Amino acid sequence: KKGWDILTKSADMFINDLTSRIDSGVNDVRGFFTGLASDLNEWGGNVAS
Amino acid sequence: KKGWDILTKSADMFINDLTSRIDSGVNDVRGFFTGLASDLNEWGGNVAS
Incomplete structure (x- = not known):
């Protein structure tokens, strides 16, 4: 049981990277908004001025 | 008994993964806020102009 966790040291960290891939979602909308x-603020601030 | 959690710790991880749709995907606590x-700053830029 000690001499194997190395084989989920892989499986679980891929899921961590998949959280980073899902992290596209918030960064996309945060960027868009x-x-x-x-x-x-440009067209408004410019046409106003 | 060692390797016989490989394909199944991942079966935990596959929704540790997908619930990242809340922590990182839509993530409304950040997204729209x-x-x-x-x-x-739009209001301020306009009002100041």
Whole structure:
């Protein structure tokens, strides 16, 4: 039982990386919403001025 | 008995994985909230202009 955990040291860390791949989700929307805000602050702030 | 958790610790991990859809995927506690905090800069940029 000691001499095998090395074989899930692999399985479980792949699932950790898959959390990082799922971490595309929040970083996408966080990027999109603040990108939209930046464009709206641009066209708004520019057309206003 | 050693290797006979390999394909099944992973069977824990396959939803330790998919629940990352909440911690990293949609992640509403960050997703839209980081939006809302930037809307204040849109409002501020406009109002100041």
